Nucleic acid binder design. Structure first.
Ligand SMILES: [Mg+2]
Ligand SMILES: [Mg+2]
Ligand SMILES: [Mg+2]
Ligand SMILES: [Mg+2]
Ligand SMILES: [Mg+2]
Ligand SMILES: [Mg+2]
Ligand SMILES: [Mg+2]
Ligand SMILES: [Mg+2]
Ligand SMILES: [Mg+2]
Ligand SMILES: [Mg+2]
Ligand SMILES: [Mg+2]
Ligand SMILES: [Mg+2]
Ligand SMILES: [Mg+2]
Ligand SMILES: [Mg+2]
Ligand SMILES: [Mg+2]
Lengths: 96, 107, 57, 78, 53
RNA sequence: GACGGAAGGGCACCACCAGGAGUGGAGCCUGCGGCUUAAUUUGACUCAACACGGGGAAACUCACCAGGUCCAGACACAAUAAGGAUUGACAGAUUGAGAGCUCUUUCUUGAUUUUGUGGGUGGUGGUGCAUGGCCGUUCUUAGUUGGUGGAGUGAUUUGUCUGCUUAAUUGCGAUAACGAACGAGACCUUAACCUACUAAAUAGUGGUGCUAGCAUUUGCUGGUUAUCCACUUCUUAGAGGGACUAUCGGUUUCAAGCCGAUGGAAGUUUGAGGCAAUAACAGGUCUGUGAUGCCCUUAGACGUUCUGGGCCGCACGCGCGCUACACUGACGGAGCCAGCGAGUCUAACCUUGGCCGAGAGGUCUUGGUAAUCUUGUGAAACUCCGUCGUGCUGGGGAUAGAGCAUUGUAAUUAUUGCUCUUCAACGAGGAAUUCCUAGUAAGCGCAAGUCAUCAGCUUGCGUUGAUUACGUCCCUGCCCUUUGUACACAC
């Protein structure tokens, strides 16, 4: 339908803070796990990203494995306006 | 802790029977070298999981049927063991693909 | 399906320089989403008090 | 979690079958020859066998942590 | 804002689907596979189901 | 090569002989055609369509019909807009409706969007005669191929065969063939045995540290394994052992083999399956797939969702089935014995025991994530003791009425269960036709599958357990050789 701005924000920062996003392929569930929004809005918004880019999508039994491509790391950095090149978010963070 | 029995029960289950036999022989092996009183490895009946399905994806053809078998073998051993001796042998060198359960009984 | 939404200014307020002090009647209510609401024929529409709302104006 | 052994081993096989088709859908170029699962206590390790290790490990630690987080995020694993 | 768009799915064919292809027909819910009998045939081997007799 | 109303030889209870159970007749179930319909959704039509799509459909399933919503129309471009793109909307009309769908109405979040162009996406839409994969069939038969050599200008042939043998192109032999490979076999799983090893309070046995009850001078039975000891015969599962037609006799070209007797747990490839060569089929499946080519559709949708109906509709024909036509039985009581399973904390799964209720079932609880508890699944056929007494009868339960319950949001077109009540056809079934050689046929139930509920269905399991024959090419089908061919899209 129409994604509210805080839903769009909370989806983008969640994808930023660890890179990957998983979403069950079932619409009209309305209770997404580990993200407090409707499951339909998660898939639809990520489809809007993936067409422009920024995301590599794989399906694997209706499970929608999403991954943040290197070109798309800087776009969400611009969207969230996080300080530039202080954290990759979060692929190489602790072990080093 | 000062040489006090725990009355442990180790139960092993997996589909891959052959390497479960080795570990069941391994668990019994490290008992007599430490002079451990025990009840031997008790083998339980195999549960033959069976699925009866048509070969065909459609409905055409002769009505041929397949039976698939996911065998599972369950064993269990009762060991009168110290607290120290069981932990440094069962928390290390665990075989692949075999499920093990460590439970305590104090009847 | 949608109305024109003509070039309206603020409503339900008389005038700011009506000889010569500010004139805005109907003193503040507990609803800021304060503000008025959709009133058609002796009825009220819930705007903020989603659960409990007891007034008949 | 007190789940029967017959249903648990079946779910373990479905877990392996999920990993098998998941890995070959992205690690197709890596010469994915299969995978192994070793359920050690509190640490189940996924042993991915691929003929091109230089890209499944990625660079600097990438392309593997993302898959590590993807399997964690789906299967509700700590 | 959306209530009429739903009907109960607590039981029956519509309350379940294949975990691989969402096929409402031919499901094997025995042992909690929840795989249709046709996707199961391709994937019986890697789960652990083998033909012996 | 195919075919032959050509000859010859083999093989097979998807062929026959000797038989057994039947089916086809009856009544209901179920599928297909037809008819009818708004729709009665479709695929498949000899074996190789027709209780098949795991297709036991009230909603879903759903693909059909009568209608109502939404865009889950990504992204790019141009408009529109911040003098507000649009969205949500209480009430009533409208609507099946408590869908703000639309209308009387005007408040609210705020380039999350709308309009159009493209272009994607979805489609149980079509094409299985564009395909992959899987499956079925030729064929579960025994067949297929090449290296070197021989024959032929060649296409091709020999090997790959007259004979005998085998389930087998299995071998013995013959021999311009020789040595091979796949298939077959070997192999794997399972059943049968193990008083031999490993062991076991989740299996069982016996004595008893503890004992108890009944009847009598010990038989049956109930509990404790620091309120005990010992063990594995029965059960289990690991390692293994064991059968190789062993021994003897007969027959055979005295070869492969076959037959009989003995012994043995096993002498039908020891029984039964898993896998299964080459070459194919215009076999089936696009209605399993987020497998897919192409085409069609895509906002008044062939997308999806919701409401209700239909797939079950009934002059008729056909197939798979269930219950019977009775005494070798129906009914009543009593005796009362299996095996393969499955099963809940990711909340109602299996349900024991107590209570209520004719019954169905309701209720209070217990156990079991399971060799522990459901469950010794105390199943049915069966056995005994009685009532009936050859009567469409107490056979049979079709149809139909009333009521009591369970499952489901919903039972009407009766989901099903139970109680009373009507007691229809059918008196062993025409033409024809199916399956089957020993724990087999047949009878009898039980479990699981689908499953909220419903099996008359299927996959397995166990109970009771025959008759007949150890064969042949008479029919049918297949293969091979010879032969004929104007066939090769192959009669
Ligand atoms: Mg016949
Ligand atoms: Mg006959
Ligand atoms: Mg008959
Ligand atoms: Mg009949
Ligand atoms: Mg039904
Ligand atoms: Mg329907
Ligand atoms: Mg075809
Ligand atoms: Mg030849
Ligand atoms: Mg041979
Ligand atoms: Mg139908
Ligand atoms: Mg029993
Ligand atoms: Mg009667
Ligand atoms: Mg009568
Ligand atoms: Mg069926
Ligand atoms: Mg002639």
């Amino acid at each position: 339908m129409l994604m509210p701005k805080e839903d769009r924000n909370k989806i983008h920062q969640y994808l930023f803070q660890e890179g990957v996003v998983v979403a069950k392929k079932d619409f009209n569930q309305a209770k997404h796990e580990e993200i407090d929004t409707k499951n339909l809005y998660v898939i639809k918004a990520l489809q809007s990203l993936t067409s422009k880019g920024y995301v590599k999508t794989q399906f694997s039994w209706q499970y929608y494995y999403y991954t943040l491509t290197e070109e798309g790391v800087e776009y969400l950095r611009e969207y969230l306006n996080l300080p530039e090149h202080i954290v990759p978010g979060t692929y190489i963070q602790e072990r080093n | 802790q000062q040489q006090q029995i725990i009355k442990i029960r180790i139960t092993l289950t997996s589909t891959k029977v052959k390497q479960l036999e080795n570990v069941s022989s391994n668990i019994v092996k490290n008992a007599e070298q430490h002079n451990l009183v025990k009840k031997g490895p008790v083998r339980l009946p195999t549960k033959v999981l069976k699925i009866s399905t048509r070969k065909t994806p459609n409905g055409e053809g002769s009505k041929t049927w397949e039976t698939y078998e996911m065998r599972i073998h369950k064993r269990y051993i009762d060991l009168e063991a110290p607290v120290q001796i069981v932990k440094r042998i069962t928390q290390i060198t665990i075989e692949p693909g075999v499920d093990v359960e460590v439970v305590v009984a104090s009847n | 399906h949608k109305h024109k939404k003509v070039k309206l200014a603020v409503l339900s307020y008389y005038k700011v320089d009506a000889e010569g002090k500010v004139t805005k009647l109907r003193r503040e209510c507990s609803n800021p989403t304060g503000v008025f609401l959709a009133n058609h024929k002796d009825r009220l529409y819930c705007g903020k008090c989603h659960s409990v709302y007891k007034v008949n104006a | 979690a007190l789940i029967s052994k017959k249903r648990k081993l079946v779910a373990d096989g479905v877990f392996y079958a999920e990993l098998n088709e998941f890995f070959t859908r992205e690690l197709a170029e890596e010469g994915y020859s299969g995978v192994e699962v070793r359920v050690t206590p509190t640490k189940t390790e996924v042993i991915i066998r691929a003929t091109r290790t230089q890209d499944v490990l990625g660079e600097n630690g990438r392309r593997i942590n993302e898959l590590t987080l993807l399997v964690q995020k789906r299967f509700k694993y700590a | 804002e959306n209530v009429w768009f739903s009907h109960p799915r607590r039981y029956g064919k519509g309350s379940r689907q294949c975990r691989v292809c969402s096929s409402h027909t031919g499901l094997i819910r025995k042992y909690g596979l929840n795989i249709c009998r046709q996707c199961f045939r391709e994937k019986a081997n890697d789960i652990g189901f083998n033909k012996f007799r």
